[PDB]
Amino acid sequence: NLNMDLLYMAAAVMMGLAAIGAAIGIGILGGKFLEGAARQPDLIPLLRTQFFIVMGLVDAIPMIAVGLGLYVMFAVA
Amino acid sequence: NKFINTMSQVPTISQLLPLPASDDDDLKHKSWDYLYEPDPKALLDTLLRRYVESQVY
Numbered sequence: 001n002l003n004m005d006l007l008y009m010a011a012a013v014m015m016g017l018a019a020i021g022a023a024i025g026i027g028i029l030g031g032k033f034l035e036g037a038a039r040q041p042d043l044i045p046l047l048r049t050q051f052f053i054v055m056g057l058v059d060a061i062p063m064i065a066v067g068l069g070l071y072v073m074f075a076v077a
Numbered sequence: 078n079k080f081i082n083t084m085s086q087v088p089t090i091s092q093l094l095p096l097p098a099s100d101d102d103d104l105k106h107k108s109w110d111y112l113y114e115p116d117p118k119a120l121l122d123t124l125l126r127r128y129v130e131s132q133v134y
Contacts, residue, residue, distance in 0.1 A: 040106045 018065035
């Protein structure tokens with residue numbers, strides 16, 4: 001019935017917005033990392049550790065979105 | 078002529094404008110790369126003007 005037709009739509013919108021947010025956020029962060037590294041490569045491993053430290057908080061919320069989207073799609077159905 | 082001592086000197090010919098050799102490799106980083114705050118080319122031009130003048134004096 002109508003329930004599943006709307007629930008697939010809901011999961012779709014949630015995970016689409018999650019995808020956009022996560023991808024473009026890491027894009028912005030990584031660009032500055034690469035430019036600064038090109039100026040002085042001695043900091044690459046250090047800044048790459050910083051990079052994961054910050055990228056975790058970038059992916060914090062979008063994976064709430066992805067988990068609830070998968071839940072709606074496979075458990076609410 | 079080089080003022081080698083109070084009682085000794087010698088005439089010399091030295092390379093001035095095209096930069097002579099040095100013994101080093103690049104120093105990657107210390108403080109800030111002022112270079113691109115103003116135009117690099119113009120500032121380097123001014124600096125080398127100063128360099129040649131100081132050598133002559």
